[PDB]
């Protein structure tokens, strides 16, 4: 399987999110990570794009997000990996 998965842990309301990608096919690809955090205080929105040469059958850590998530907050993280051709993966956190 080629897939995006999320390594996630928590210490109190402190959350660490590490998106990971494994490819069945060695390639060059475009990786986009979007994150959105909304609370009563305010909002944080990140958009990050990188072009990456990636080997197959190896998990790759795509970035590391440290978020502070209270019970009232919303978080959404969308990770996409594509070559504009036959590779297109997309996954959202939380599941």
Numbering used by the authors: 3 to 97
Give the original sentences from the paper that presented this experimental model.
In this study, we report the crystal structure of CsgC, the first among the Csg proteins to be solved. Based on its similarity to the N-terminal domain of DsbD, we propose that CsgC has redox activity and CsgG is the potential substrate.
There were no gross structural changes associated with disulfide bond formation (root-mean-square deviation [rmsd] Cα backbone atoms = 0.65 Å), which is consistent with the high degree of similarity observed between NMR spectra of reduced and oxidized CsgC. In order to confirm the oxidation state of CsgC in vitro, mass spectrometry was used to measure accurate molecular weights for the oxidized and reduced forms. The reduced protein had a molecular weight of 12,066 Da, however after incubation with oxidized glutathione (GSSG) this decreased by 2 Da, indicating formation of the disulfide. Strikingly, the introduction of the disulfide bond caused a large increase in protein stability, as evidenced by a shift in the thermal melting midpoint Tm value from 66.1 ± 0.5°C to 92.4 ± 0.8°C. A unique feature of the CsgC structure is the invariant CxC motif that connects the BC loop to strand C. Similarly, the CxC motif of CsgC is partially buried and the intervening side chain is always an exposed, nonpolar residue (L/V).
